[PDB]
């Protein structure tokens, strides 16, 4: 039982964005799909719902003129399109099967969220630099290593290690805002120092707004 | 709209002690004939989607631990976490589904208090790729410490630096309740090459001495 959304986007003021929500694991027509947005640092705001069965919608008055929720029953997908975008619409947009409550059961499922940034500033992909392990980043039998992801706009970048197979000991830090208006962040992992000669560490960086994908090998 | 207001906005509580989060609705969400309050509680961690804990003000979702309990009726609601665990660090949101638009509270951040833990300190010299591009970033890493207050100072040939670094802290760790911190000092390749000793200097309650990590350029 899953909801899976499309990836992050950058738009400029006055454009529109369309986010999709792929449902799987249940009969798509049984329940209503909702859209909830969360501006960064802000509370959750409900945008509206669609009954997937008949296609009827209800929108929150704050969005009533600017949002369209639709679905493709055959594709098992719901869509939310927000028009006449403003910088204020910068947020994470979620789709959700909010509070399905029956006499039998109660469940509630959310997509992973789609980040949308609305800005007139230029999109910029990151440079990825290795943070190599060395005698200055060992501590006993442990070594720290990482990747520096520098000078990108807007958020988010995602970082994984070894395609997601290395998660133990990973810290991916929140981005900082440089005086330039660009972001940078780092991602580190602690590992055995005894296996630096046999193990390969690759940080997988994706910046979907710039269509940038970097796989950087971190060597001693 | 039914406006949902929470209090406090943020809370800091020791492992194993009681955390109380409040919610007030601007109008009653109670269906009196059914003694049914249309009130729910959600837990959210940074970068993750919300997770339903409680509905009808007081019923736990299946698989929610017993230490979470919701109560109240009408306009005032409380979520209580009785014996706080490390994985409970999160923002908690109330939610009404009595009338449209559906609305949520502003969130209450629940932080964990724990015992002092000193950081492990690591330093990273610039990469050759970056130096090739004309900039030098040095990264100082403070791993798994508590409390969050840590002071990093950069010294270049013993000269204390100001204005050329940025730092960031992780969310609180969901298993050991510690923080980590990354500090980046950035210079032009030209300035980097004018100096020899690059040092991160770390002050923290867990440490018996301002700890220095340093390297010599080359």
């Amino acid at each position: 039982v899953q909801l899976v959304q499309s990836g992050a986007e950058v738009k400029k003021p006055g454009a529109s964005v369309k986010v999709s929500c792929k449902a799987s694991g249940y009969t798509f027509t049984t329940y209503a799909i909702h859209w909830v947005r969360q501006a960064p640092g802000q509370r959750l705001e409900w945008m509206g719902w669609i009954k997937v069965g008949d296609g009827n919608t209800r929108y929150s008055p704050k969005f009533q003129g600017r949002v369209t929720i639709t679905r493709d029953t055959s594709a098992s997908t719901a869509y939310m399109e927000l028009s006449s975008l403003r910088s204020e619409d910068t947020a994470v947009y979620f789709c959700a099967l909010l509070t399905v409550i029956t006499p039998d059961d109660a469940f509630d499922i959310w997509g992973q969220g789609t980040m949308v940034t609305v800005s007139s500033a230029s999109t910029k992909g990151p440079s990825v630099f290795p943070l190599a392990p060395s005698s200055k980043s060992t501590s006993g039998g442990t070594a720290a290593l990482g990747c520096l992801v520098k000078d990108y706009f807007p958020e988010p970048v995602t970082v994984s290690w070894n395609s997601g197979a290395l998660t133990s000991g990973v810290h991916t830090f929140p981005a900082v805002l440089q005086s330039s208006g660009l972001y940078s962040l780092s991602s580190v992992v602690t590992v055995p120092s005894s296996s630096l000669g046999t193990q390969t560490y690759i940080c997988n960086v994706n910046h979907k707004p710039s269509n940038t994908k970097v796989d950087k090998k971190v060597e001693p | 709209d039914i406006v949902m207001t929470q209090s406090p906005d943020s809370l800091a509580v020791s492992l194993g002690e009681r955390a109380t989060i409040n919610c007030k609705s601007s109008q009653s969400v109670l269906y009196s004939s059914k003694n049914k309050n249309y009130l729910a509680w959600y837990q959210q961690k940074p970068g993750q989607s919300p997770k339903l804990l409680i509905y009808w003000a007081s019923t736990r979702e299946s698989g929610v631990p017993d230490r979470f309990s919701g109560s109240g009726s009408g306009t005032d609601f409380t979520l209580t976490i009785s014996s706080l665990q490390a994985e409970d660090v999160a923002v908690y949101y109330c939610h009404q589904y009595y009338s449209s638009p559906l609305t949520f509270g502003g969130g209450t951040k629940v932080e964990i208090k724990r015992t002092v833990a000193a950081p492990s300190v690591f330093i990273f010299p610039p990469s050759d790729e970056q130096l090739k591009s004309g900039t030098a970033s040095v990264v100082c890493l403070l791993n798994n410490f508590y409390p969050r207050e840590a002071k990093v100072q950069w010294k270049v040939d013993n000269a204390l630096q100001s204005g050329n670094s940025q730092e960031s802290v992780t969310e609180q760790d969901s298993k050991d309740s510690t923080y980590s911190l990354s500090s980046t000092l950035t210079l032009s390749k030209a300035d980097y090459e004018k100096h020899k000793v690059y040092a991160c200097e770390v002050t923290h309650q867990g440490l018996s001495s301002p700890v220095t990590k340093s390297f010599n350029r080359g």
């Binding site: 409550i101 029956t102 | 059914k34 509905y55 589904y97």
Partner: peptide, 14 residues
Amino acid sequence: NPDPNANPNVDPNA
């Protein structure tokens, strides 16, 4: 009274 169309996924009993 509650609006049953506020969230269609909620059954007026549980």
